């Protein structure tokens, strides 16, 4: 039966007493002006002690309490739960998990669950030992949480064998197990009746299938039950016929953190008073002596909180918040006034937390304590790179070493081969000058239709001007050919997949080594925002990604009128307001570009706002770019402080003042040949390559064909809100994703979209 504890308000002073009892001088627990006092995760034991200890008392668990022994105790914080505070009221619930008779004695495993305001806050684990010879078997039982077993249903007999077992029980028997991956999250509940023979064996858990998103969905149940068993058949099966997913991942080499000197208290009364452990063994010599102990043993719990403090200080840099898991094995006993070198290393990772192992030895060099702790990484933010820096062979090394990498690339490379007839791995591995697709046999023709259905839609005044992206591919084409004098790896339709892929692969290796923090925030730069969304939120399959990203590139290549030699009427310029003048601000570059915009009736807009007062990028009409680049050159050699002329003169005054400067430079570029060649400036650099004015208002007509393409590839069911909310920084908005009336409006304001406008307008769709 569950043991209910008592409600417990954490007084400011109960904390003072406890911290000082175990010797934890962390500032998070000391009353400071303009901060609420925090309570040590150690304090959980003070709250739950009575609920927990009660568990070893019943008559069915007959033990000699004077020979009782503490084996271990740990605290686990349930994710999302903030630490204990001075204000909090805490309900405690102690369930006794496993009570088993062993050769040497009786073992009782207890579990506490400290809840606060309805929600559970942290779990406390204690296991105690009554030494002796027990036959109590009728009052013995064991629950264990089996590891997750992964199983790769590859063949047809595989699926047959699984259907053969009566415990394999899925919802729709018609489910196509062929070629899926199953996981088995199992709990096995056992009751003993004899020395080795089980009385009963239950084994239950959900069966799940991997999605393309790599999410896992419930498919059915494991449901086993047996009396007079001898072993667990289900687990044995899964052991031999599967692999065991362990969530811990070692580092390459343990990394030493520190070796610290500790000391046990002069008397034990101080700890006993704060903790409620009035066990005479620790305080009264005649009881200690009656139980045949070396003396008045120090509270094993003290050493727990004492050592923990060391881990807290040196491993978490005294950020109480960071330690979310700690556990402790009481190897041997310690007398008061013993010295304790305890050492701490960084051993591995788990789910973004640092796995930390420690070992405490005494003066006689005997191990007394050993446990581990999980500690949060520093606030992490991931930024995903956009185009421009792609190199041949990029991230191909990682393809050779990491399994995560191979799966990402290979899934993609396959999709590309089978639907467009090229290998993205090849393009990346050896930058090919040219590349022809061949629309060969029945599969050749399948491929070419996927080329033939490439559409670029263009909503122009209500009208939808759609064109084939691949003009030439038709029912009589035998092949198409992509071209590039340099190498196709630097042609965006391939560049984008290559980048997205390299990144998504690299991130999934990091994820596999358990290195990704849970609450990490992420953002991507133009292209990288798809890689970012894919990597952290699994918003789309690996194939859906390379697809979207590949079309995004074909789309860009076609949205601009082109020459015979396929030349562009547009381009991008990378500006540095710093180089023009130390005076030349951001409002100054904005102002200047907006005037040369309105004046010449051409097209210039600021496209990239990258680094304040340092890195900007403008796109648009090549002629307008040649004006701004020259207008700028002038203002520099002229030393024109526009912040100063704005004070001394009027709006219309300085307006006209540069309207004149503009008009003398604008004449010069209009009179230049067909596709003007942008040249360098004092603060202007031409972005060689770019030909589309993207991230301007220019691409406003090519939105709604892509807005359908995206909707056909980013399914509702793969958008898990919490993965994005507060962590995802878009590019349109520069503010963290929130699904609020507030946010929705800002988007409309920056874009004007029907789907949005209705939603803002009738937000009270609240109730289902």
């Amino acid at each position: 039966d569950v043991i209910k504890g008592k409600d417990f308000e954490i007084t400011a002073k109960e904390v003072y007493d406890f911290t000082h009892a175990v010797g934890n001088n962390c500032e998070d627990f000391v009353s400071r002006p303009d901060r609420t006092m925090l309570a040590p995760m150690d304090f959980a034991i003070v709250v739950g002690w009575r609920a927990i200890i009660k568990a070893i008392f019943p008559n069915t668990v007959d033990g000699d309490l004077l020979k009782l022994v503490h084996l271990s105790n740990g605290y686990k914080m349930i994710p999302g739960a903030k630490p204990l505070q001075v204000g909090d009221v805490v309900s405690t619930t102690a369930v006794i998990e496993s009570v088993v008779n062993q050769p040497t004695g009786k073992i009782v495993d207890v579990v506490g669950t400290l809840s606060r305001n309805g929600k559970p806050v942290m779990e406390v684990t204690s296991s105690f030992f009554y030494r002796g010879n027990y036959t109590d078997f009728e009052n013995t039982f064991q629950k264990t949480v089996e590891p997750v077993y992964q199983m790769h249903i590859k063949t047809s007999k595989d699926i047959a064998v699984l259907r053969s077992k009566e415990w394999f029980q899925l919802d729709d028997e018609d489910f196509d197990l062929l070629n899926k991956t199953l996981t088995f999250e199992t709990e096995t509940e056992v009751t003993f009746k004899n020395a080795n023979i089980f009385s009963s064996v239950k084994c239950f858990g959900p069966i799940k299938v991997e999605l393309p998103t790599k999410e896992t969905v419930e498919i059915g149940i494991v449901d086993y039950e047996a009396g007079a068993s001898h072993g667990n058949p289900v687990v044995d099966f899964l052991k031999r016929n599967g692999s065991t997913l362990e969530q811990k991942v070692n580092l390459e080499n343990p990394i030493p953190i520190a070796v610290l000197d500790s000391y046990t208290p002069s008397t034990n009364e101080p700890y006993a008073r704060v903790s409620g452990d009035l066990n005479p063994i620790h305080v009264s010599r005649h009881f200690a002596s009656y139980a045949n102990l070396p003396g008045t043993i120090t509270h094993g719990m003290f050493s727990s909180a004492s050592v923990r403090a060391l881990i807290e200080n040196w491993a978490a840099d005294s950020v109480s918040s960071r330690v979310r898991g700690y556990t402790c094995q009481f190897v041997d006993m310690v007398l008061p006034n013993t010295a304790l070198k305890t050492s701490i290393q960084h051993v591995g990772m788990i789910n973004g937390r640092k796995l930390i192992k420690f070992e405490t030895r005494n003066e006689d060099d005997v191990v007394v304590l050993t446990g581990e702790a999980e500690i949060e990484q520093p606030v992490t933010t991931f930024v995903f790179t956009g185009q421009g820096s792609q190199e041949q062979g990029m991230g191909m090394d990682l393809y050779k070493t990491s399994k995560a990498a191979q799966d990402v690339w290979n899934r993609a490379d396959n999709h590309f081969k089978d639907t467009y007839g090229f290998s993205i791995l090849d393009i990346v591995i050896n930058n090919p000058v040219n590349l022809t697709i061949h629309f060969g046999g029945e599969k050749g023709k399948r491929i070419r239709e996927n080329y033939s259905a490439m559409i670029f839609e263009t909503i122009v005044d209500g009208k939808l001007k759609t064109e084939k992206i691949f003009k030439e591919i038709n029912e009589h084409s035998t092949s198409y050919t992509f071209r590039s004098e340099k190498g196709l790896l630097s042609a965006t339709q391939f560049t984008q997949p290559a980048l997205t892929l390299m990144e998504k692969a690299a991130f999934e290796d990091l994820k596999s080594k358990g290195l990704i923090p849970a609450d990490a925030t992420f953002a991507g730069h133009s292209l990288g925002e798809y890689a970012a969304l894919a990597s952290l939120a699994d918003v789309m399959s690996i194939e859906s990604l390379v697809e979207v990203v590949f079309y995004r590139g074909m789309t860009m290549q076609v949205a601009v009128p082109r020459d015979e030699l396929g030349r562009s009427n547009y381009g991008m310029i990378a500006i540095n307001p710093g180089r023009v003048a130390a005076s030349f601000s951001q409002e100054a570059l904005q102002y200047v570009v907006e005037r040369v915009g309105k004046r010449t009736g051409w097209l210039v807009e600021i496209v990239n706002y990258n680094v304040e007062n340092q890195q900007y990028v403008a796109a648009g009409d090549l002629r307008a770019l040649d004006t701004v680049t020259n207008v700028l050159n002038f203002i520099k050699l002229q030393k024109i402080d526009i912040i100063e002329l704005q004070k001394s003169l009027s709006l219309e005054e300085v307006e006209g003042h540069l309207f004149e400067i503009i008009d003398e430079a604008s004449k010069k570029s209009a009179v230049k040949p067909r596709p003007l060649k942008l040249e360098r400036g004092f603060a202007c650099i031409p972005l060689v390559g770019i030909s589309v004015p993207f991230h301007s208002t220019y691409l406003m007509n090519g939105v709604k064909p892509f807005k359908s393409f995206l909707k056909k590839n980013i399914i509702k069911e793969n958008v898990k809100v919490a993965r994005l909310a507060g962590k995802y920084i878009p590019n349109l908005t520069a503010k963290p994703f929130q699904v609020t009336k507030e946010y929705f409006q800002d988007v409309y304001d920056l874009t004007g979209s029907e789907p949005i406008k209705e939603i803002i307008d009738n937000w009270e769709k609240y109730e289902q």
Binding site: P33, D34, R35, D317
Partner: protein, 192 residues
């Protein structure tokens, strides 16, 4: 982490009282005003001792004093820079700064709370100082004045003079004399 860094940068072991040498009182107060800009009331640092000309002592929480320490670390210059071939005016500030040996933030807002409590305690024991009884001038730490010419409690003054108010050491050593005798702690490292 802080202790680590503060150590490999030849500064002290972070404490509640930092001492900055070869900076104007104005200069020092400038950097502190900057540092304090970014902190909440309860974490702010102030000048505690104006021990002398370009010798000062800032005081507050150790961590926020460490922050001041960083903002300073960039403004200074390597001691053996040899700016002997640089024209005087054009040279860079060379100056010393180190944490002092003390467990508490004396002469700071951190202690104001204990002011009234100490006095209430001083009364509950025999202690008080009547100006009648003091036989020779006892120069006020802030005023430079005599403590005898005092409307209120002399006890209460020297309490608030140690706990909350700065020490304008040169102005409190206004007097003229042939000889000063140092009975205070620390041989030649001491106040004398």
């Amino acid at each position: 982490s802080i202790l680590e860094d503060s150590l490999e940068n030849n500064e002290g072991v972070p404490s509640p009282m930092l001492s900055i040498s070869n900076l104007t009182q104005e200069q020092v107060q400038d950097y502190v005003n900057k540092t304090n800009s970014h902190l909440p009331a309860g974490k702010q640092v102030e000048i505690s001792l104006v021990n002398g000309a370009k010798n000062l002592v800032v005081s507050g929480p150790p961590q926020s004093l460490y922050g001041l320490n960083l903002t300073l670390r960039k403004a200074k210059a390597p001691s053996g820079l040899d700016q002997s071939r640089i024209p005087f005016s054009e040279r860079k500030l060379k100056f010393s700064n180190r944490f002092l040996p003390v467990a508490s933030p004396f002469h700071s807002h951190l202690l104001v709370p204990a002011s009234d409590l100490i006095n209430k305690d001083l009364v509950k024991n025999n202690v008080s100082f009547n100006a009648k009884d003091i036989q020779i001038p006892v120069y006020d730490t802030f005023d430079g004045s005599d403590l005898r010419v005092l409307s209120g409690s002399i006890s209460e003054r020297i309490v608030d003079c140690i706990i909350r108010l700065p020490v304008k050491w040169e102005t409190t050593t206004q007097f003229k004399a042939t000889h000063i005798l140092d009975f205070g702690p620390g041989g030649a490292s001491g106040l004398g």
